[PDB]
């Protein structure tokens, strides 16, 4: 809630694809429950990872372009970028601990 970005198909190439640093991407959709279930976790994460990561949500419900580009045929799917480069991805719902396990595994 202090770094989250309502990313769009336009402001992506510039935001994620080209920005030194790790920006996590939570692909969601108003129709997929577990999708929006991760948003809260991202916020509880926003602070603890503020300086190593920037949580950025993306609504394919109104932003198609993006998803296909990376072959994402499932939601929610998380993409951990590093200098506009998919470095790691996690699929499906998960707990704050499984997500911190994921970030600490790569992002460090």
């Amino acid at each position: 809630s202090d770094k989250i970005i309502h990313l769009t198909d336009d402001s992506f190439d510039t935001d994620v694809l080209k920005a030194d640093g790790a920006i996590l991407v939570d692909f969601w959709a108003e129709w997929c429950g577990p999708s929006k279930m991760i948003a809260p976790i991202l916020d509880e994460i926003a602070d603890e990872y503020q300086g190593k990561l920037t949580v950025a949500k993306l609504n394919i419900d109104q932003n198609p372009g993006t998803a296909p580009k990376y072959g994402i045929r499932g939601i929610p799917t998380l993409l951990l970028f590093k200098n506009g480069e998919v470095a790691a991805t996690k699929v499906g719902a998960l707990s704050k601990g499984q997500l911190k396990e994921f970030l600490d595994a790569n992002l460090a």
Binding site: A29, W31, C32, G33, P34, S35, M37, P40, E44, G71, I72, R73, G74, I75, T77, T89, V91, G92, A93, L94, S95, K96, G97, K100
Partner: protein, 320 residues
């Protein structure tokens, strides 16, 4: 340092738990409920719900569950978004460990339900997220006018097949037998669509492997149950596995008497029917039912749990 304590604690945010929540909240047990990662339960992964008594039309899992959340909070249930990783049921108060903190309680209601079951194929794992999916309600979107597969012969498969049917160009239902276990009313809808719709039946076949490339799943290979080596190839854009579930009882390993994964309860027609192996610990919902497993039965038991818990907690207060 700030371990949250409560007379009663409920695990799970599904129909079973929320019902226990509200009944326990009215017994003024100031219940604390932990949602889990799947807040709302399995029902949240479905659309229409046609057998929730008293809701003849247009009811959907999400809706029923959003309504139960509201109900449970209305009677001041402390709902906490968290997931329990470890539990100690040998020391009273019971110790439960979750990602956002530590909890202790004088009585526990375990309504952890169950998780989607998988076959165990690495190809299945390799493509999860790129063609292999568990929830159609979530990913059916990615298959507009494309061929897609469903595997399983139960209600979830049929419904997903029936649901996918209006999204995909063609649906291929795969199943280990010639017979389906889903409700008849549904099996009828299936055949009626198999006969003049876009659903193709692939009976007596089992998922042997999922094939594809960096861009995702391109097809699958069924096996044929009546001819060990008849393996056939099927060109499809993605597949949804629907082969049942398994109770979420892992965090309770060797602390509660389990039976094929399910938590064992006293049952019986004399009360304390949801009593687990440890006095003061109760289980309601699918986590303790290997047979019926409906939303209506889960809500039923979640209720008995709350009542049994109160009978117990009162006993403690009494014998003091």
């Amino acid at each position: 340092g700030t371990t949250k304590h409560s007379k009663l604690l409920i695990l799970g945010s599904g129909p079973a738990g929320y019902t226990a929540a509200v009944y326990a909240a009215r017994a003024n047990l100031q219940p604390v409920l932990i949602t889990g990662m799947e807040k709302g339960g399995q029902l949240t992964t479905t659309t229409e719900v046609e057998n929730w008594p008293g809701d003849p039309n247009d009811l959907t899992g999400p809706l029923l569950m959003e309504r139960m959340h509201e109900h449970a909070t209305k009677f001041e249930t402390e709902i906490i978004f968290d997931h329990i990783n470890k539990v100690d049921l040998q020391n009273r108060p019971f110790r439960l460990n979750g990602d956002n903190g530590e909890y202790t309680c004088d009585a526990l209601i375990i309504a952890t339900g169950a998780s989607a079951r998988y076959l165990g194929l690495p190809s299945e794992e390799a493509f999860k997220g790129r063609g292999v999916s568990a929830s159609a309600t979530c990913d059916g979107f990615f298959y507009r006018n494309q061929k897609v597969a469903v595997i399983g012969g139960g209600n979830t498969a049929v419904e997903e097949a029936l649901y996918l049917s209006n999204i995909a160009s063609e649906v291929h239902l795969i199943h280990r037998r010639d017979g389906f276990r889903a409700e008849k009313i549904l099996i009828k809808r299936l055949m009626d669509k198999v006969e003049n719709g876009n659903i193709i039946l692939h009976t007596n076949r089992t998922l042997e492997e999922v094939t594809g490339d960096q861009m995702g799943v391109t097809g699958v290979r069924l096996r044929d149950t009546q001819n060990s080596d008849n393996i056939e190839s099927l060109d499809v854009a993605g597949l949804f596995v629907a082969i049942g579930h398994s109770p979420n009882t892992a965090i309770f390993e060797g602390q509660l008497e389990l039976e094929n994964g399910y938590i064992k309860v006293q049952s019986g027609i004399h009360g304390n029917a949801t009593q687990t192996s440890i006095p003061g610990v109760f289980a309601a919902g699918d986590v303790m039912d290997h047979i019926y497993r409906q939303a209506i039965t889960s809500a039923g038991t979640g209720c008995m749990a709350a009542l049994d818990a109160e009978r117990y907690l009162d006993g403690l207060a009494d014998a003091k």
